[PDB]
């Protein structure tokens with residue numbers, strides 16, 4: 001009989017990383033696959049689904065404006081529970097570390113449905129950084145039957161938590177599957193036109209634990225850089241969270257050389273990253289994409305769960321102190337040795353074959369294939 | 377300033393095990409303590425609160441008839457979330473492995489409130505046995521800042537999961553704090569009067585994974601034993617779950633020698649256990665109580681997370697197969713050597729001072745005491 005697989009996800013980053021897997025799953029005659037979105041994000045999720053031309057089988061439309069963690073958890077849980085009364089897949093695949101990831105896993109567990117965790121095992125060891133992502137991924141790890149770890153270090157993290165080695169596979173990150181298709185040699189954009197010959201710093205900031213004072217500190221450091229370096233401009237595709245938007249407007253409204261724009265489609269964003277001089281970000285996904293692009297990243301966090309990019313020299317933790325961020329950005333602008341150190345391209349997160357590996361592992365595990373795939 | 381401590385629980389077993397801790401907390405002028413119940417159980421919770429004379433500060437009244445896991449989780453989370461908007465304790469203490477335990481921990485975490493886990497670290501390694509308790513305690517363990525493990529092996533379970541040693545304390549189980557006060561010399565009850573001279577088997581059965589076929593298999597075996605042995609009577613205080621009640625009525629409804637009764641108050645239940653010939657149960661708490669009483673227990677499960685009781689000879693895993701349960705119960709009724717092997721009293725789960733250790737650990741952690749209390753000492757450490 002055909003293996004019944006359901007992907008469950010709800011946000012921009014999950015959708016970008018899950019879309020290559022959703023498309024891979026469809027290529028296999030022995031799999032009957034379903035796509036379920038919680039729509040924890042609405043506009044930002046639809047931007048991705050539309051770009052990949054993916055239409056979900058089920059769309060739970062849960063997003064509320066300025067929603068709380070309790071609200072997302074309850075809404076996702078209740079709606080998925082209702083879904084699972086009628087449709088019973090053999091396995092539910094969740095992604096990464098959102099509240100949708102955890103609620104999806106929990107709803108599946110409550111119906112005794114098996115769970116596979118895509119992007120399993122990332123850790124900072126700090127329950128409040130990132131908040132609540134660190135616990136979302138740890139609690140999802142308690143539920144998951146199969147763990148698709150992007151890297152060996154992620155697998156080691158799960159081993160240290162007493163997970164069975166034979167339930168964890170090192171696949172690479174599906175983000176690289178997508179990234180390997182988007183960059184364009186001849187790329188053009190109206191915003192890049194007005195940047196012109198100036199150095200471009202690409203900025204995103206949205207971590208929950210960074211809202212308020214930490215983000216004010218980041219933005220003050222950025223204002224100081226722009227004021228001091230005349231040949232520098234910032235492009236900031238601003239997250240739809242109104243708390244972020246308030247902070248962005250407060251600091252960068254009336255700035256000629258900081259461009260506040262709507263979130264970019266992923267092909268556009270990847271191409272902006274490729275064109276950037278360097279990146280300031282607190283994004284998870286951007287940290288995994290940057291090494292492939294050989295693009296220096298100052299990570300505006302006190303922690304990271306991407307140590308592989310740090311080892312490659314691409315990623316440097318800058319924290320959230322104003323002066324520290326200023327000094328690190330100034331260094332990248334004025335020290336060619338430091339810039340060179342941070343701008344060597346490598347592929348520590350994937351080779352573009354992660355989706356294939358995940359599906360082939362599923363097929364092996366359930367007895368459809370006699371052989372296991374290669375590891376990343 | 378006073379340390380603000382809130383206990384959060386909602387079911388019969390949590391209330392029994394948390395009651396001694398609630399009362400212990402009230403003793404210390406250093407602590408401002410609050411009691412919050414979800415009332416995941418209504419009647420069965422109220423029975424415990426009334427017995428211990430505990431009046432909750434907050435009662436969320438969540439119980440619905442035939443409620444699902446998703447329902448309990450959502451209702452508890454939403455109501456606790458609302459509570460924490462208004463009241464911010466320094467630490468929330470949750471108990472054990474119920475959906476209330478997990479939802480309480482999660483709600484506290486969402487408000488960045490510290491969590492202490494009473495009865496931390498119990499494991500079967502099987503996510504469907506017990507269901508959902510194994511995962512409830514595992515996920516609670518991910519959230520908890522402090523882990524109050526009843527025994528050394530529970531601490532070892534947490535260490536194996538990469539929990540830091542300095543965050544785990546071995547306290548004994550608070551169940552023993554309660555048990556040490558309840559058994560009295562000349563206990564009597566109208567139901568025991570009916571039993572008279574006969575051997576009494578005390579039965580409870582309610583595990584979620586046992587509902588339906590497994591429980592019917594248990595009950596078929598038990599009905600056979602009652603039929604075959606005329607001097608045996610069963611006392612069964614039946615859980616309020618309608619699903620359990622249907623099965624109890626189906627298999628025992630016509631038997632004069634199976635007493636189907638309402639859930640007993642804890643004082644009465646403990647005294648019935650003390651007077652029983654042996655116990656048939658799938659209860660967690662009864663497994664911890666029985667060694668103290670030297671009472672053989674056939675555990676009606678395919679797993680247990682009380683291995684200390686198994687090693688003591690008190691607990692024997694019987695599974696849920698009809699014939700196996702019948703054979704093992706028949707053995708206890710007919711084999712004096714086997715009965716003797718299972719009826720040696722010991723105290724592997726506590727010495728009655730668990731609640732005090734928990735409170736003193738809290739006071740040390742937060743700087744109110746210069747000294748840390750000694751851990752509960754087990755098995756091997758006595759003797760070696």
Ligand SMILES: CC(=O)N[C@H]1[C@@H](OP(=O)(O)OP(=O)(O)OC[C@H]2O[C@@H](n3ccc(=O)[nH]c3=O)[C@H](O)[C@@H]2O)O[C@H](CO)[C@@H](O)[C@@H]1O
Pocket residue numbers: 011012013040041042043044045064065066067072097098099100131132133206208239240241242
């Ligand atoms: C706990 C959790 O799961 N957080 C994830 C969520 O954080 P994020 O900060 O996006 O949190 P939410 O998904 O709750 O969205 C926050 C708020 O932003 C607004 N909003 C968001 C999306 C949208 O399409 N339209 C819109 O209006 C809404 O007011 C919403 O309530 O998404 C991020 C991706 O960007 C992930 O990195 C985070 O791990």
Ligand SMILES: CC(=O)N[C@H]1[C@@H](OP(=O)(O)OP(=O)(O)OC[C@H]2O[C@@H](n3ccc(=O)[nH]c3=O)[C@H](O)[C@@H]2O)O[C@H](CO)[C@@H](O)[C@@H]1O
Pocket residue numbers: 387388389416417418419420421439440441442443448473474475476507508509582584615616617618
């Ligand atoms: C997942 C979870 O947390 N399960 C716990 C719960 O299981 P338990 O089997 O009691 O599950 P519930 O707490 O959901 O109660 C089930 C149903 O029983 C009925 N009911 C229950 C209590 C009551 O006072 N009145 C009443 O009418 C209701 O119809 C209720 O919906 O309590 C048991 C103690 O007995 C614990 O061992 C279990 O760990």
Ligand SMILES: O=c1ccn([C@@H]2O[C@H](COP(=O)(O)OP(=O)(O)O)[C@@H](O)[C@H]2O)c(=O)[nH]1
Pocket residue numbers: 012013016175204237262263264265266267269270282283284285286289
């Ligand atoms: O304007 C943007 C900003 C980011 N991204 C992509 O979104 C993903 C990261 O999502 P986000 O930073 O929202 O969440 P996180 O990764 O931190 O969970 C990465 O693939 C980015 O390339 C995008 O397509 N457009």
Ligand SMILES: O=c1ccn([C@@H]2O[C@H](COP(=O)(O)OP(=O)(O)O)[C@@H](O)[C@H]2O)c(=O)[nH]1
Pocket residue numbers: 388389392551580613638639640641642643645646658659660661662665
């Ligand atoms: O009729 C009864 C049955 C049990 N108990 C007590 O209830 C606790 C265990 O609760 P339960 O079996 O409902 O749940 P579990 O321990 O399996 O979570 C133990 O302290 C028992 O002594 C009780 O007081 N009256």
